[PDB]
Structure 1
Amino acid sequence: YVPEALMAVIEEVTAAYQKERVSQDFLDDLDRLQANYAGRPSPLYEATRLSQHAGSARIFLKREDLNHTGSHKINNVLGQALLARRMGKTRVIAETGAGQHGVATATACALLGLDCVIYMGGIDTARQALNVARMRLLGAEVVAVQTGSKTLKDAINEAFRDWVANADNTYYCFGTAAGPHPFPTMVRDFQRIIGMEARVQIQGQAGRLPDAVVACVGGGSNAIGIFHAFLDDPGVRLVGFEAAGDRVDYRPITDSEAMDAFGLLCRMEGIIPAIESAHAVAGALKLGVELGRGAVIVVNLSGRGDKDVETAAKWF
């Protein structure tokens, strides 16, 4: 899984990142670089119809659910290319299966003036003229890989040989679900972006900081993102609603509480939530009854309201 040859290079990366993590700049820069570019920042939607089932509080939904697939990978990949610039590297390489991650990188590469080489297997090249051409309009060099079996793994190594030999100037940009993932802190940190955008937008739309920021927690990572900008705010409660059934308060929400919250979003708001998020809307709702009038509750609508629908329409 990782050629020990990659160890000094991954280490130099991990090393430069930490240095970056020392303060708000790197994310600050990232935030500015995504603005208006490809879906960031996502909208923070005030659900006024929901107020009447929430103790006369004001619920704001932080629409993560409106991101589409890879404008989102672009926003992820830009921070990786912004790390190359800060590290001083001037070229970026990556591998690409069906070509989607190559198109993302090629995009950031070119947004930031970085040269860009993407490795892709000869099998992948012949049947994907379109992403290859995207990539080529965007400026990268697309290297059709003719060794081993001309598949994905194949690209991966040629890229590893490339990255080993060219580490002075070259940042390797990971992202294929089957490719390497050597840098988990990074990937968590980028999601704090969600928090920073909610903090700004709440200050904009309500004129103060919220009385509570809230997410469904038990789901992988990337709901948790909403919190971190808010940790410092002594006035702000942070509540993580856990999928029960029969610095942050964890609290539980039952299969029922979440379904009532669900159908109630469908009807009052016209938005169909992820089940995951219904738990959180349910709790935002608990919270506002419990906090009363003009309470300001920001809620993360995380993720993909595509059939949990299956499930929801059974529930009724």
Structure 2
Amino acid sequence: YVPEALMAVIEEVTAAYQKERVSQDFLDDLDRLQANYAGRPSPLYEATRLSQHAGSARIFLKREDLNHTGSHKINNVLGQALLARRMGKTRVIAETGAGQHGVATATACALLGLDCVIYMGGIDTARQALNVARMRLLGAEVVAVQTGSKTLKDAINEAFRDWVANADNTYYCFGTAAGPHPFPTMVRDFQRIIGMEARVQIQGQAGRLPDAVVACVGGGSNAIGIFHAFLDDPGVRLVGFEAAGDRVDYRPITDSEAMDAFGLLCRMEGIIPAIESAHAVAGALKLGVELGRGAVIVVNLSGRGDKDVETAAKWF
């Protein structure tokens, strides 16, 4: 599943990232660097037409759903490249199948100014000359790996072979589903940027801190990532909505209630939520009818607009 040979190398990265977690500075720095670069900060939208169904509170939807073809992947990558740069690494590697992660990796590296090399499967190479094209346009040595299978796994290995050799100057950039996810806390932390961005936006758009910041808890981290920046704001309730069918407060939301919110959001604002987001919404509206006129609530709309259209359409 992972060579043992990766252990000292992974241990190096974790220990180095552990030093970053002491302050907000790493995160702050990432947020600076990615500002207006590829999608970040995702928009905060005041859903004025939901207001009437939420006790006339002001519902603000943190729009993590506005991500598709591009925005997305650069986010993980840029975090990593920044870490590589602060570990005094000078060079970055990765594997990619079809080429999307190699392009993101190559992107983060031109941006931050770091040599970069990408490992592509032999017959993967000659069936997208284009991403290769992007990658070489981005300045990245593409090593088209001939040796056995031809279909990713052999590239993972050279990439692995590389990383152990060169570990003093090289960072491995992870992001393919078929590759290793060795640093799960580092991934979680990158999610806190949602709340960091949403805390600036809600005070600029709403003129203060919110009454509440709300997320569906089955989105995992990334739904929950909106909370961290509001932990020291004693006036701000943090409410995680649990899917039920039939410091943080946790509250249940049934299938029906999610479903009805899903449809109201499509009809009131023209936005088609993930069933995940519709629970956070359904709770946001109950919470506004609780809190009344003049309340301000922030909702993490996490998960994918498309996915659930089928299930929603059956349901109705």
TM-score bracket, normalised by the shorter chain, equals over 0.9
Structure 1 residues not aligned, in runs of 5+: none
Cα shift at 1:151: 2.0
Query: Alpha-carbon deviation of 1:298?
Result: 0.1
- 1:153 offset after TM fit, Å? 1.0
Whole-angstrom CA distance in 1 between matches of 2:278 and 2:189: 25
TM-aligned CA distance change 1:69 to 1:228, over 3 Å = farther
Q: Deviations over 1:254-301 (max 9, x none)?
A: 111111111111111111111111111010000011011111100001
Tell me, yes or no, if the aligned pair for 2:219 and 2:303 is still in contact at 8 Å. Answer: no
Give, in angstroms, the shift of residue 169 of structure 1: 0.5
8 Å contact from structure 2 (residues 244, 254) kept in 1: yes
Q: How does 1:83-94 map to 2 (within 5 A)?
A: 83-94=83-94
1:107-127 CA-to-partner distances (Å, cap 9, x unmatched) read 000100000000111111010
* Alpha-carbon shift at residue 17 of structure 1 (Å): 0.3
Higher mean alpha-carbon deviation, 146-155 vs 40-49, is at 146-155
> CA 1:194 to 1:256, structure 2 compared with 1: closer, same or farther past 3 Å?
same
Residue aligning to 2:20: 20
1:69 Cα deviation after fit: 3.7
CA–CA distance in 2 between the matches of 1:120 and 1:104? 14
The TM-score normalised by the length of structure 1 is 0.98
Q: Structure 2: where are the runs of 5+ without partners? A: none
- Cα distance, 1:4 vs. partner? 1.1
Deviation at 1:68, TM superposition (A): 1.4
Query: What is the CA-CA distance between 1:221 and the residue it aligns to?
Result: 2.7
Structure 1 position 34 matched with structure 2 position 27: no
Q: Secondary structure at the match of 1:116?
A: strand
Q: By how many angstroms is 1:222 displaced?
A: 1.4
Q: Tell me, what secondary structure is at the counterpart of 1:218?
A: helix
Q: Distance in 2 between matches of 1:264 and 1:138?
A: 44
Conserved 8 A contact 2:239-2:251 = yes
Per-residue CA shift, 1:66-91, capped at 9, x if unaligned?
11143210112101000001010010
Alpha-carbon distance in 1 for matches of 2:149, 2:123: 8
Report the Cα offset of residue 56 of structure 1. Answer: 1.2
CA shift for structure 1 position 225: 0.8
- Equivalence map 1:1-316=2 (5 Å): 1-316=1-316
Distance (whole Å) between structure 2 residues aligned to residue 148 and residue 270 of structure 1: 50
Deviations 1:164-205 (CA, angstroms, capped at 9, x unpaired): 000111000011000111110111100111000000000100
CA–CA separation in structure 1 for the residues paired with 2:66 and 2:291: 28
CA distance in 2, matches of 1:28, 1:219: 24
**Equivalent position SS for 1:142:** strand
Q: TM-score, normalised by structure 2?
A: 0.98
Alpha-carbon distance in 2 for matches of 1:71, 1:103: 12
2:91–2:114: 8 Å Cα contact kept in structure 1? yes
SS at match of 2:30: helix
Deviations for 1:105-156, whole angstroms, at most 9, x for unmatched residues? 0000010000000011111101010100100000000000011222211100
* Cα displacement string for residues 33-84 of structure 1 (whole angstroms, at most 9, x for unaligned residues): 1100000001000011111111111000001111114321011210100000
SS at match of 1:179: coil
Q: What does the per-residue CA deviation read over 1:212-266, in whole Å, with 9 as the maximum and x for residues that have no partner?
A: 0000002333101111111111111000001101121110011111111111111
Q: Following TM superposition, where does structure 1 have runs of at least 4 consecutive aligned residues deviating by more than 2 angstroms?
A: none
Q: Secondary structure at the match of 1:12?
A: helix
